[PDB]
From a paper:
The protein exists as a homotetramer, with each 902 amino acid-long protomer organized in three distinct functional domains. Remarkably, the tetrameric state of ALDH1L1 is indispensable for catalysis because the intermediate domain transfers formyl between the catalytic domains of different protomers.
Subsequently, we used cryo-EM to characterize the structure of ligand-free ALDH1L1 at high resolution. A 3.7-Å map was obtained from a dataset of 86,276 particles when D2 symmetry was imposed. The rigid Ct core and four Int domains were clearly resolved in this structure, while the highly mobile Nt domains were not visible in the symmetrical map. To determine the fraction of free (not occupying substrate entrance tunnels) Int domains, we performed local 3D classification within a mask encompassing each Int domain and calculated the total number of particles that contributed to empty versus occupied classes. This analysis produced estimated average occupancies of 76% and 83% for the Int domain in the ligand-free and NADP+-bound structures, respectively. This suggested that a disulfide bond formed between the two atoms. In an attempt to resolve the Nt domain of ALDH1L1, we performed refinement of the cryo-EM dataset of ligand-free ALDH1L1 without enforcing symmetry. The resulting 4.4-Å-resolution map was very similar to its symmetrical counterpart, except that weak density for a single Nt domain became visible. This Nt domain appeared to interact with the NADP+-binding sub-domain of one of the Ct domains.
Numbering used by the authors:
A (entry chain B): 493 to 574
B (entry chain C), C (entry chain A): 315 to 397, 405 to 902
D (entry chain B): 821 to 902
E (entry chain B): 657 to 738
Amino acid sequence: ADVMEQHQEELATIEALDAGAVYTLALKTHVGMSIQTFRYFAGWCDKIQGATIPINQARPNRNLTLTKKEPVGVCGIVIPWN
Amino acid sequence: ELTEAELATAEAVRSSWMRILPNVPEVEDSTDFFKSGAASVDVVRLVEEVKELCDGLELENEDVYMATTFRGFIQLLVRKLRGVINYVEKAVNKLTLQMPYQLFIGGEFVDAEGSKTYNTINPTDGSVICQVSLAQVSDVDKAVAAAKEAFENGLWGKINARDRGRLLYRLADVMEQHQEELATIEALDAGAVYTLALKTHVGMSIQTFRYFAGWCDKIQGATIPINQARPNRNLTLTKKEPVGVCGIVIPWNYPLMMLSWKTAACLAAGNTVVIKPAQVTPLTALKFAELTLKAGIPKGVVNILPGSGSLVGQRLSDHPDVRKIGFTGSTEVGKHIMKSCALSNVKKVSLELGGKSPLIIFADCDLNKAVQMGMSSVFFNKGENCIAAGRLFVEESIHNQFVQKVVEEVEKMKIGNPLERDTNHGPQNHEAHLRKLVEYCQRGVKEGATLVCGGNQVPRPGFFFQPTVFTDVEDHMYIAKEESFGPIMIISRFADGDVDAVLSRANATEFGLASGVFTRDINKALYVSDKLQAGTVFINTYNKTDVAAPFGGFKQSGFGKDLGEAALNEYLRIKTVTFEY
Amino acid sequence: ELTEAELATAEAVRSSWMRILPNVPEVEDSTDFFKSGAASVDVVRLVEEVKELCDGLELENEDVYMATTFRGFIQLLVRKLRGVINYVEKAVNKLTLQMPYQLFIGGEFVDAEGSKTYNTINPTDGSVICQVSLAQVSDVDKAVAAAKEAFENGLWGKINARDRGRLLYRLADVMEQHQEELATIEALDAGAVYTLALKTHVGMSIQTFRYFAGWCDKIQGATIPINQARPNRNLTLTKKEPVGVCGIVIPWNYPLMMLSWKTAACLAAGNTVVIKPAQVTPLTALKFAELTLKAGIPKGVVNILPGSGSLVGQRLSDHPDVRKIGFTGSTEVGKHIMKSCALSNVKKVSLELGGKSPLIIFADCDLNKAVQMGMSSVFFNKGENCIAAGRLFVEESIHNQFVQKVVEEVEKMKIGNPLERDTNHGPQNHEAHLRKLVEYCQRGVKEGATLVCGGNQVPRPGFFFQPTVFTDVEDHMYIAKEESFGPIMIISRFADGDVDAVLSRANATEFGLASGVFTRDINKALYVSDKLQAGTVFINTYNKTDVAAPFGGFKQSGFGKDLGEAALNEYLRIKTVTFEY
Amino acid sequence: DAVLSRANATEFGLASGVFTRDINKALYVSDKLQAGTVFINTYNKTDVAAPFGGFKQSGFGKDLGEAALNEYLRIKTVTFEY
Amino acid sequence: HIMKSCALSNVKKVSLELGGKSPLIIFADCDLNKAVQMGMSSVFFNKGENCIAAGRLFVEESIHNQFVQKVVEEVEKMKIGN
Ligand SMILES: *SCCNC(=O)CCNC(=O)[C@H](O)C(C)(C)COP(*)(=O)O
Ligand SMILES: *SCCNC(=O)CCNC(=O)[C@H](O)C(C)(C)COP(*)(=O)O
C-alpha cells in the first residue's frame, strides 16, 4: 500500500489513459480506495481468529474442540472493466 | 441387603457389561464402567438393556455418570426399586400464595443465627406481610462455602454447558407456570402494578433466563494466529472459563428483574451465585429460590441471604472465596463496595449507580407521542426506575403546549390498589423513601421551581405519592442536579434551533446512565445520539431496553454491562493456552 | 350476531379503550388500537381488564396484535366465547405408532396430483410398511407458494426473533416427548438401531433445535467505523436478514438428524423451508411435520415433499422464488443441483458430497482404545455415515496386533432386529444399496484385498451385511480411492516413524470431509492436525461432532458449513445501511 | 408502500437509496428495500470496512469488510479427547 | 457460465457481483438542493461506469418538476473533455 502510495500519481495517470477515469477522481477513488483496501486487509491478516467451542463432554472423559481458519489455496479472481 | 430376585437381575446386568464393554476380562465389584473403555453410546445401551429386565424402573443417563463402579450402580439400582418447605399462606388475587420467609443456603430453607427476623412491609395497606429471616455473618460463610462446594466439588461444574442451559431454560418455563403468582408477590412486596409486573418484572425475568440459557453453549473462545517460532509451529487458543463464586447485590426498585439480569448471566457463564436481595423487597427472590428446586438446579448453585446491606453486602466483598461482585444501588454505598474489593483479593466489580438521564424534545416531534412517552419515561413502575427521565429539555416553541397536555393526562392516571387492573400509577416501596420524596418536592419549590401539579402525599391508607411536575428549572438548582428516584417530571426550556446549547446542558452531569431524544429530523437524531454522554440512548421512545441489548453506565453511573453478550464477559475469565511443536 | 349480554361487555371494552389510550376522542368501530398510540404495556393492560369482565376467557397477547380494530377485536372475542390427520397404526416396541403417509404443504396433510404413491421398505423384515405419497411438480409449486406466503404475508416474518426461538425450543420439547416414537420409526424406516437412534438420530435432532432456537435472538450485525465525509458524519450498520425460502434436500443415511441440522439453522435465521426428504426414508420427516402443529409453528413455514430426487429436487433449483438450496448426498447428483442453481437466479448453495476420510494410527497410541474407536469410526450406524473412516493408516509396528484384536471384537458384535437392545450392528437401508456393497467387496478381492472377515450378505430375512475388514491395501486400488458408504474397514500399512510419508498418502484424495489421528505424542497430533486436508479432524476419538461445532467439506466434499454459528451465515444475508448527517 | 412495491419489483437488486428527513420513513424504507447496500441521505458511500454484495440475481458472497475474508478462508474443526 | 463450470470440475466456491438495478427514492421531506448533487453523484459518477449506479430515481410528484429543472441546469455546467 505504501509502495502504491508512492506511485499513486503514476497509477492515477494510467487509469486516465487506459480506462478514461478522471484524474481527480482516480486519486480519491480508483487509487485511493485501492491503497485503503490493502492497508485494511493487511491489518486483518493476524486477527483472523477461530473459536474454541464448548461441546458435550463425553463424561467423565474431557473433550476440547477448536476451529482453525486456514487459507483455501489458489484464488482465480476475474475483475470487471468499470 | 440383597435378596434372591435382586441377585438374578444383578448377574444379568453383569452379563450386559461383558457384552457392552470391549475387553473387560472380569466384571468385578470394584471394576469401573468408563475406565474399561465406554463411549456415551454405551451409557444409553446400558440403560435401555436394564429397562428390558425391570418393567417400570424409570432410569436416566445422569445416574450412570454418578454410579460408575459396579457396587455403586447395583446399590443405586436396588435403592430406588425397593424404595417439606415452611410457607406463609395468603389468599389474594384469586390465588393461594406460598411465600418462603427463610434463608436459602444449599437448596435448603433454614433460619438465621438465633432465628433473628424483621418485618417486610406491604405498601398498599401499610401493615406487615410476614416476618423474613435476617441473615448474619455466620450464615454468609455457609452460603459462600455451599457455593464453593457446588462449583468445585458439586455437579454444576462437571456437567456440560448445554446441560446448564437446559436447566436454566426449564427455570424460565417453571417461572412462566408461576408467573401470575410472582406478579402477585411483586404487588404485595414492592408495590409494582400487577399489569406491569407480568410484562416487565416477571416478563423480562422469564425472557432473561430464556436468553442466557441460550448463550451457555455458544460462549466461544478464539484460536489466535501468532508468530510461529520458525521452523517450530505454535498453536494458541483461548478458553472462556467461569470465575467461580458471584456475590450479586440487587436494588429494591425491581426485586425479581434485577436479580434475573445478573443471576442468569452468572449461571449461563457457569458460576455458583450468592444473591443478596434488598432488605425491603426479599419475597420475590425467596420465591425464586423455591422454583430452582422444581427446575432441577443442583443444591448450592443459588444462595439467597435477605438482611441489612452493611452486614451481608460488606462480608461478600471481604470474603476471599468470592471472586466477583455485581452491586447496583446508591452511589455512596456502591463506592464502599469497590473500596473493600481492592483491600481483599482484587475481585471484579460492575456498578449501576443510578443516573440522571436527560430527554431532549424538539419541535420536529409529533407532540401527541411525546406526551405518552414523556409520562412513560418518568411515570413508569411507580416512578421507581434507574433509567427514569431526570430532566426533560423541551423546546420553547412547544413548551406551553406540551405541559398543558401532560397536566390533563396526569389527572386521568388512576391511583389505587396495585392488584386491581384499573390502577396505572401504583404506591411507592418502603416509607423511608416516601418521606424523602416529600422533602425533595418541598426543596424544589423552596429553591424556586413552579410546581404545576402533585408534589405531596395522597391522604389514603398506603404509601402513595402524586405524579409531580416541575417547570421553569435552571441548571444551578438542586432537583436539576440530584436524582429524584421517583415520579417527578422536571421540565426545562431551551431556545428554538439550539442543538449544541441544550447538549452542553444535557451532558453537564457527572451521572449519565441513559438518555433520549424525540424528533422526526434524522440529522438531529443521529447527531444528538452521538453527542449524548450516556450508555443507553433512545430515539422516539424510552424505557425500551431488551435482554439482548447491552446496558450500563459511562461516568459516575459506573462500568461493566448487564444484559446481552457483553454481560457474560464480566462473569467469565479468559484462559490463554499456548502449545509448541 | 350480537346479543344483549355481548353488548354489555362490548361497551365495557369500549370504556377500557377510552381509559387505556391517551387522547382517543371517540372509540369508533373503525378506530385502531396502535395507530391511536399504544405501547406493549397497554396490550397487557387490555387483556387483564377483559379477564375481569369475562371469568374464563383464556385470552393471550397474540390475538390483540392480529385484531387491532374494534370490529376485529369484538368479532374475535365473541367468536371464541360462544364457540383430524390420517395415520398408519402399528403396535411395535410397546408403542402404537401414528406415522403420516401424505405430503405436508401449509400445515395440512394432502395427497399428490392423482393420489400417486410408492412403497417405503422395512429392512428388518423386507416387507412394506405402508404406502407414501409421491410428490409431483404441481405439488412443489404449492409448497413454494405456501412458503413464500408464510414468509412475506404470514405470521413467521412479523413476529420477533425471540418468538421464533420460543417456538423452535418448544419444537424440541415436543420432539423430546415423542423421542421413543421417533426412535422406533427410525428403526422401521431406516434400520438404525433403537439404542443409537435415541442418542444420535433423535438425540442430536433435539439438541440441534434447542441450539439454533437459542441463536435466533443473538444473530447480531455490526456498526462499522468508516471514513467520515468530514465535517459531515456517517453512520454505517449491518442488518442480518433472512434470505426467504430454503429448498433443503437431505440424504438417507440419517433421516431425522440431517433434516434438523439444516432445517433448525434456516428456521433460526427466520426462513420458511421446503424440505425434500429421501425417497427411501420419508416417515421420520412426515412425523416431524405432525409435531410442528403441536409445537405451534405457523402453517406454511415447514413444507415436506417425499418423492423422486430428479422430479422434486430439480424443480427447487429451477423455481425462482426459492433463494437457497442445501443439498447433501452423492457427488454426481449434487453437482447437477449446482449447475441448475447458476441457470436460474444465481441462488446460494451448500454441499456435503461424501468424504473418503483417513484415520492414521501411531505406535504411541493406547491400542485398546484404538480398536473400539477404530470400530466406532467405521462400524457406526450400520456403517452408513458420511464421515465414515475410509482408509485406516495403521503403523507397521502394530499392524498384526491391531488387526488380530479387531477380528475377535467383530465376531462379538451382535446382529439382528434393530428394535431389540441386544443388537449392536443393524441392517442397511434400501436394498439397491446392499447389492452395490456386495460388488464393492467382490471388486476388492478381485483387485487384491485380503478379506479378513465379512464381505458378503448374511443368510437372513432382511437386508443385513457382515462387518467387513480389508488388509494389505495399496493406494492404486479401487476401494482405497472410491468411498464404500458401508461397514467396510480398509486397513493400510505404513513405515515406523514416517509422519510426512503417510500424510502424503492420506491427503492424496480429492474427497476430504473428515479425518482422524490416534497418538499420545502431542508433537505428532498437533502437527498432523494442521497437515490433514479435512474440515473435521479428530484426535484420540472419532464421530465426535456436536451441534455447536462447525462441520463441512474442503475440496470436492463441498463448501458451506452446517451446525454451529457458521451454519446461520449460509441461510442469512447481510444488508448494509449507511446514513449521512 | 406503493413506491416500495415498484422499487423492489426487480430481479436485480445490489444497492439502493432513499433521501428524507423523516426518520420514520428512512428506517422503514431501509428495512423494506431488497438490496445489500442501502444508502440514506447519501449515495456511492461504500467503505473498505463496510461489507458489500448482492441479494437476488446481483449474486452472493461479500467483498470488503470482515465478511470478505470468510469467502477466501476455510474452517478446519480439530477435536481432542482426554 | 462461470458458476456452471465450477459445478462440473472440483466443486469449488464462487462469489458473484452481477451488476444490479439500484433504485433511489426521493421524498418531499428531503432538502432538494442536497438531492440534486447526490442525484447526479449517484448516476454521473466515474463517467457513469459504476455497478452501484442509480438505476431508477423514484422522485415524488410534489417535487418532480422542481427537481428535474434543477438537474438540467447543473448537467449543462458539468465540464467534458480531457
Ligand atoms: S433498572 C432497569 C429498567 N428497565 C426497564 O425500564 C425496562 C422495562 N421495559 C420493558 O419491559 C419494555 O421495554 C416495555 C416498557 C414493556 C415496552 O416494550 P413494548 O413496547 O414491546
Ligand atoms: S453425516 C453426520 C454424522 N454425524 C455423526 O456421526 C455424529 C454422531 N455422534 C454423536 O452423536 C456423538 O458424537 C456420540 C457418537 C454419541 C459420541 O458422543 P459421546 O462420547 O458424548
